[PDB]
From a paper:
In lasalocid A biosynthesis, a polyene polyketide intermediate is converted into a bisepoxide by the flavin‐dependent monooxygenase enzyme [name]. Remarkably, [name] acts on two distinct C═C groups in the substrate molecule, forming two (R,R) epoxides. Like other members of the class A monooxygenase family, [name] consists of a Rossmann‐like FAD binding domain and a β‐strand‐rich substrate binding domain. Our work has revealed that [name] has an extra‐large substrate‐binding pocket that allows the polyene to adopt different conformations within the enzyme pocket.
To visualize how the substrate molecule binds in the active site, we determined the crystal structure of [name]‐FAD in complex with a diene substrate analogue, 1. The [name]‐FAD‐1 crystal structure was solved at 1.85 Å resolution with final R work and R free values of 0.16 and 0.20, respectively. Each [name] contains one FAD, one substrate analogue, and one chloride ion. No electron density was observed for the oxazolidinone head group of 1, and therefore it was not modeled. The conformation of [name] in the [name]‐FAD‐1 complex structure is nearly identical to that in the [name]‐FAD structure (RMSD = 0.13 Å). 1 is bound adjacent to the FAD isoalloxazine ring and makes contact with [name] residues A70, I72, W74, Y218, H239, V252, and V342. Critically, the re face of the C19═C20 alkene of 1 is exposed to the active site cavity. In this configuration, transfer of an oxygen atom from the reactive C4a‐hydroperoxyflavin to the alkene is expected to produce an (R,R) epoxide, which is consistent with the structure of lasalocid A. We propose that the subpocket, formed by Y218, V252, and V342, and the nearby I72, determines the alkene binding orientation. In our crystal structure, the subpocket accommodates C19‐ethyl of 1, presumably generating binding free energy and promoting catalysis.
Numbering used by the authors: 20 to 487
The structure:
Amino acid sequence: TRSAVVLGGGMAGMLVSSMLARHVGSVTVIDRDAFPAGPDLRKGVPQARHAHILWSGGARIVEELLPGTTDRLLGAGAHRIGIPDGQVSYTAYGWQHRFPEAQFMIACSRALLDWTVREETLREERIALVEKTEVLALLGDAGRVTGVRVRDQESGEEREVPADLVVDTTGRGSPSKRLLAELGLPAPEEEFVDSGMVYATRLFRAPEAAATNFPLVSVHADHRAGRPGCNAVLMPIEDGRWIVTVSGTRGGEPPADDEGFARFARDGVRHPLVGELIAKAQPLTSVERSRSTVNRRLHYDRLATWPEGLVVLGDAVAAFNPVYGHGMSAAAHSVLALRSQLGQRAFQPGLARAAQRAIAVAVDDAWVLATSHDIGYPGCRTQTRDPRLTRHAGERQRVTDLVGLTATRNQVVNRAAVALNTLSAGMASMQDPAVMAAVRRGPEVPAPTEPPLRPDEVARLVSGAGVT
Ligand SMILES: Cc1cc2nc3c(=O)[nH]c(=O)nc-3n(C[C@H](O)[C@H](O)[C@H](O)COP(=O)(O)OP(=O)(O)OC[C@H]3O[C@@H](n4cnc5c(N)ncnc54)[C@H](O)[C@@H]3O)c2cc1C
Ligand SMILES: [Cl-]
């Protein structure tokens, strides 16, 4: 019984559809894109050309919604990389000592990740993906949404799709501001923090022996230094490839040309390690860029009027600077927030509003982590009323930096820091007495004086071929 319509069949739409099909009789997913039969790039998810880190916090929720997905990913060549044991990371505070595993991430092409999630979701026959279809309007009125009007691209025919619940998951380019204006609702408060960050990515074929068990390698900006923030990330993906994404804020953007890419990875960031490693590998693709890096949030949950039967989640409600790697995990937390409200309130009036407020809570940690570190870069453009960004940014940063510095050299602080950063634990967790006690106990290991690479990792950067 009951029907749901989901706008957008990307990550949030597939996760939310899988969840909803366990609560309603049918789910219809409307997407303007065409979908490949295999793990290919598609125009509706251009960000799949860039490195995607799936932190443990989101991975565990994906697993809860779509059992078997994590193993299916690893089974297809995705890498499980332990954090911090499997990462070689030059943080703002220095090299991270590679303590034993506290958390993990899943490393693969976003195209394979999307394909795996969609194929698993659509095994449920009561979920139908309706491709190459435009969303024209929300049906109903400002009091209650009752479906959507859509247009088949090939035919041109329009039709009404009824729904007891409409969920907008159309991503960063979502048209919900327009759709909700057409209903007669006031505009939501828009909040943004725009560092001017630009991404540049190439794919490489890794040296053959390093195609597995190779670490995630990252060189981070120093958010406290009054210079443009620049980063470089090397991440293993399936079938023996490396995806390498470099990034820079206003005044430090990476160039678009292949030769300037490798130069930036060496000299544009604070340590040349990623540039040194890509010199061991064979480039496979030319440079792809992206400017979709603004932290932007729409406060739908605080609107004076909200229609029954309408929920917005994923990048459509809150989108983040991708260098922090939280977007997919925030979407998953948001799907669970909607599920929690469905279990509590069924489809009573107040469900959609309660879900929208719960979704605002679900994305808040990712929002604070990204915005608190972006707000400081030169020339950052901001629009916010959040006193955590406007009043108490300094002492929050002094607490952040004390934790971040100590996490590089203290196993207990690192465990707490990565639990929060993978969105496996909430912000309050860091106020636990045991964590601040370990912070005060200070470093337990020396600061690494060189990249903490293992000999057996660097040994696999060469073949030994030209040697008798
Ligand atoms: C460069 C970059 C790097 C990133 N790296 C990471 C990372 O390392 N880790 C991480 O967790 N996240 C990362 N993200 C964020 C992640 O890509 C998004 O958070 C995630 O895709 C959000 O899913 P979504 O379903 O809300 O939107 P999307 O995945 O973008 O899906 C939106 C869907 O809606 C459809 N659609 C869009 N507009 C319309 C329309 N008008 N009508 C109909 N259908 C429409 C699209 O075709 C698509 O199918 C990165 C993002 C970028 C840009
Ligand atoms: Cl993009």
